[PDB]
Design a protein around this ligand. Structure first.
Ligand SMILES: *[C@@H]1O[C@H](CO)[C@@H](O)[C@H](O)[C@H]1NC(C)=O
Lengths: 222, 373, 216, 72
């Protein structure tokens, strides 16, 4: 049982965008399919539903007339075409299965996909710039010195930061992103290590920004 | 309602004929010589007809070359008990066939596995003088074949037991069919009497056949697979094609649709392929319900219809009806009930097997009788 | 359409406590209500349907009650994997299937002895200066409690309105916090001064600790 | 599709189209034979138990054949 969704991205307000969701592992041709969105940090919002045969479509009031749902049982797909997008439509969209099979009354969602993120903000997509926050040379001989990376000026969220491709996890703090005054995001990832380890072990932070297909490996040296 | 119009006929006349032909001098020796080589052979009978012949069980070989040599050798002392079980095998079939023929007086209406196994039945079907489509159809639905075929015990002599398995032929295949469901259609006035009821009597199956329509009034004597309708042309009337017009317009001059008139204000429910018709009259409670949500519709007085999508149960008074959950598309053709076109004072209060022209003409008779005074 | 309200907006309870959350509808939805549990950063999982029918596989500690307009969800012994958000959703007769506002459920803050923050200061890199922007970073590491004051002083002049703070969540191992204050200036403004300092005041510190660096 | 149904409220009647036909229209007879043995009456000592079981089975077989002959 699996629902794989695709078609997300960033789209300027007023434009169109089509989401698709393919199903595998169950008799897709007999289940009603729901689309349910969730704003970042807010609750769940029901969007639409389509019956098993595809001849009964229901839309929420906030998306009525704009969104349109369709299904294809020969390929086990559900499509949600959203045109004339407002900024309030920026959210993560799940396709979900209706619990009860072969009915014209819709009850609830029991199998949820992973989701597709849809951002409407008029700002464009920019990959991040990674700058090294180098350890100070005053660091005591002991000494527990600290270094890190600054992931700056990226849009939209999120970026994922690892260290040494995952080999370094202890003492790592990746802060939550902040919305800079520029309308772009920026965060920092810091690591505290014994000062006697500097100049001995290579320290590299790996930054990943999927919305821009950006993979950066930044080496941090004193 | 038109089950009485059918003619009567002998069902096993062909098998009995082949049996009477099997009693002729030399016909059983002919079949035995034909089956001397293999277990299946086509034999031209003295009646002209060529039939397939099967040797489904060989006991003479086993008894006479595997059991009697070992038994009556020196003093019939047996050394192993696996021989007893090996003889209980290869003999259960003959005993069960004997029992089946004894209880059914020599002719069984469904052909059992004892009479003919599925492998033997498929081998017989595949070597029949029929088209490949008929072979495929019979091979896919062997159970319906067994249900619609007979086994007539024919003869036992010359060390051979013979019975004729009389199989269907399925001459007409893949032509379009349609079922017609009917329900009483009455008026809805609040008076206890003076309430006229009209019903259609042509309910049952219909199939296109050689430019005509084979109509089956006893729809219970028709089996239904996924969407294939197995019926017997003997349980059928033959009508012109124009009868289908009774669905597009019931007052057409070409064909006269048989109806039924009564004055019985009884609530009923007729479950169709994809939904249910509800004739709700009087003070009866009529309800449409979903399995997970309870009652979802209350029926007003009259003849209404609901689809099987979302509706899983129809209750009329104290009777409960489960609707067929078969997939399909339903359509509701809005129109005025025909019963509102007649005068309650001139309406014929009782006629079982009538028609539109007959009832309409009898109305003229009664109106002329009333107007003369 | 039907309006659904959940109570409480959020709650904080220890492991093993009996937690009872409420859901209310504007009208009669008699028993057409589901409860979903969305784990942090996961997909919503269906906890129960028809307001009492547990879904197969859900631990028996969850119990749904109520009807008409009022329903309750009860966890007899709250567990670690029970944190997250809980959503009630009605499916009364031909959608819109409205959801609820949700209910946040978190474990209590695991009180730790007071710990003073380790304070570091990072000047802007040369590569970042090549692009015309300077970002000085003041880092506070491994402190409890979450309250702390971080001020910026450039040439002994107090800064205001050009710094952004970001704080991590409480660590799962030592139950401490970390904070980063980033001060962003133009390259010309950064080159127009000499010494940069961040001063931190906090319960675990005897004196406000100031960490500074001279440009160069 | 594959099946449709129309309800005429005019005459309170439903029609279910989309089915396919399989009409009998005739018969096909076929002779099926079972080769039997007319084993002659044995005469041996029924001292063994397995031989008694074999004798019972032979009695069952002969009685079935005798019913079949007597069923005409
Ligand atoms: C009934 O009414 C008149 C008889 O005067 C005629 O026009 C009509 O054809 C009659 N129908 C019959 C006799 O079936």
């Amino acid at each position: 049982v699996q629902l794989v969704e695709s078609g997300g991205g960033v789209v300027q307000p007023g434009r169109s965008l089509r989401l698709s969701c393919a199903a595998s592992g169950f008799s897709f041709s007999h289940y009603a399919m729901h689309w349910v969105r969730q704003a970042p940090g807010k609750g769940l919002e029901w969007v639409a539903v389509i019956s098993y045969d595809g001849e009964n479509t229901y839309y929420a009031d906030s998306v009525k007339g704009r969104f349109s749902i369709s299904r294809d049982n020969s390929k086990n797909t559900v499509s949600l075409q959203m045109n004339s997008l407002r900024p309030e439509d920026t959210a993560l969209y799940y396709c979900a299965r209706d619990r009860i099979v072969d009915d014209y009354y819709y009850y609830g969602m029991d199998v949820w996909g992973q989701g597709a993120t849809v951002t409407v903000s008029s700002a464009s997509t920019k990959g991040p710039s990674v700058f090294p926050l180098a350890p100070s040379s005053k660091s005591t001989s002991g000494g527990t010195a600290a270094l890190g990376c600054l992931v700056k000026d990226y849009f939209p969220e999120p970026v994922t930061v690892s260290w040494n491709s995952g080999a370094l996890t202890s003492g790592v703090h990746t802060f939550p992103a902040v919305l800079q005054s520029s309308g772009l995001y920026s965060l920092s990832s810091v690591v505290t290590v014994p000062s006697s380890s500097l100049g001995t072990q290579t320290y590299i932070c790996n930054v990943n920004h999927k919305p821009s297909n950006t993979k950066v490996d930044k080496k941090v040296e004193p | 309602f038109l089950g009485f119009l059918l003619g009567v006929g002998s069902a096993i006349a062909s098998g009995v004929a082949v049996c009477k032909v099997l009693h002729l001098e030399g016909e059983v020796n002919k079949i035995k010589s034909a089956l001397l080589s293999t277990n299946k052979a086509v034999v031209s009978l003295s009646n002209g007809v060529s039939v397939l012949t099967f040797k489904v069980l060989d006991l003479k070989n086993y008894i006479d070359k595997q059991l009697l040599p070992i038994l009556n050798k020196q003093s019939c002392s047996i050394s192993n008990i696996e021989t007893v079980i090996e003889f209980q095998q290869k003999n259960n079939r003959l005993l069960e066939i004997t029992r089946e023929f004894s209880v059914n007086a020599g002719v069984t209406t469904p052909v059992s596995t004892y009479m003919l196994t599925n492998s033997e039945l498929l081998s017989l079907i595949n070597d029949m003088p029929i088209t490949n489509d008929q072979k495929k159809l019979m091979s896919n639905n062997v159970q319906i074949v067994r249900q619609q075929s007979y086994s007539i015990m024919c003869i036992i002599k010359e060390e051979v037991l013979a019975y004729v398995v009389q199989l269907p032929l399925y001459g007409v295949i893949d032509t379009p069919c349609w079922k017609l469901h009917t329900s009483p259609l009455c008026t809805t006035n609040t008076k206890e009497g003076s309430n006229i009821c009209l019903t259609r009597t042509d309910r049952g199956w219909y199939c296109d056949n050689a430019g005509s329509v084979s109509f089956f009034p006893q729809a219970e004597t028709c089996k239904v697979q996924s969407n294939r309708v197995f019926c017997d042309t003997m349980n059928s009337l033959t009508l012109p094609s124009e009868v289908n017009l009774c669905n597009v317009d019931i007052f057409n001059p070409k064909y006269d649709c048989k109806i039924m008139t009564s004055k019985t204000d009884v609530s009923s429910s007729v479950i169709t392929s994809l939904g249910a018709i509800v004739s709700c009259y009087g003070k009866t409670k009529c309800t449409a319900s979903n399995k997970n949500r309870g009652i979802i519709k209350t029926f007003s007085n009259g003849c209404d219809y609901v689809s099987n999508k979302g509706v899983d149960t129809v209750s009329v008074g104290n009777t409960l009806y489960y609707v067929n959950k078969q997939e399909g598309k339903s359509l509701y053709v809005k129109g005025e009930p025909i019963i509102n076109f007649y005068d309650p004072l001139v309406f014929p209060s009782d006629e079982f097997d009538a028609s539109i022209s007959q009832v309409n003409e009898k109305i003229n008779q009664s109106l002329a009788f009333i107007r003369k005074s | 359409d039907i309006q659904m309200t959940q109570s409480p907006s959020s709650l904080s309870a220890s492991v093993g406590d009996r937690v009872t959350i409420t859901c209310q509808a504007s009208q009669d939805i008699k028993k057409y209500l589901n409860w979903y549990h969305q784990k942090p950063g996961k997909v919503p999982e269906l906890l129960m349907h028809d307001a009492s029918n547990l879904e197969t596989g859900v631990p028996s500690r969850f119990s749904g009650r109520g009807s008409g307009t009022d329903f309750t969800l009860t966890i007899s012994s709250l567990q670690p994997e029970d944190i997250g958000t809980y959503y009630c959703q009605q499916y009364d007769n031909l959608p819109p299937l409205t959801f609820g506002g949700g209910t946040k459920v978190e474990i209590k803050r695991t009180v730790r002895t007071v710990a003073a923050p380790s304070v570091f200061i990072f000047p802007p890199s040369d590569e970042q200066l090549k692009s015309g922007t300077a970002s000085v970073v003041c880092l506070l590491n491994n402190f409890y409690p979450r309250e702390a004051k971080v001020q910026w002083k450039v040439d002994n002049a107090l800064q205001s309105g050009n710094s952004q703070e970001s704080v991590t969540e409480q660590d799962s191992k030592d139950s401490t916090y970390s904070l980063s204050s980033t001060l962003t200036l133009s390259k010309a403004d950064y080159e127009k001064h000499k010494v940069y300092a961040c001063e931190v005041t906090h319960q675990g510190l005897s004196s406000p600790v100031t960490k500074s660096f001279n440009r160069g | 599709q594959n099946i449709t149904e129309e309800f005429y409220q005019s005459t309170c009647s439903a029609v279910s189209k989309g089915y396919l036909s399989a009409l009998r229209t005739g018969w096909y007879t076929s002779v099926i034979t079972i080769e039997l043995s007319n084993i002659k009456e044995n005469k041996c000592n029924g001292t063994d138990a397995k031989v008694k079981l074999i004798k019972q089975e032979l009695d069952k077989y002969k009685n079935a054949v005798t019913e079949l002959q007597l069923l005409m």
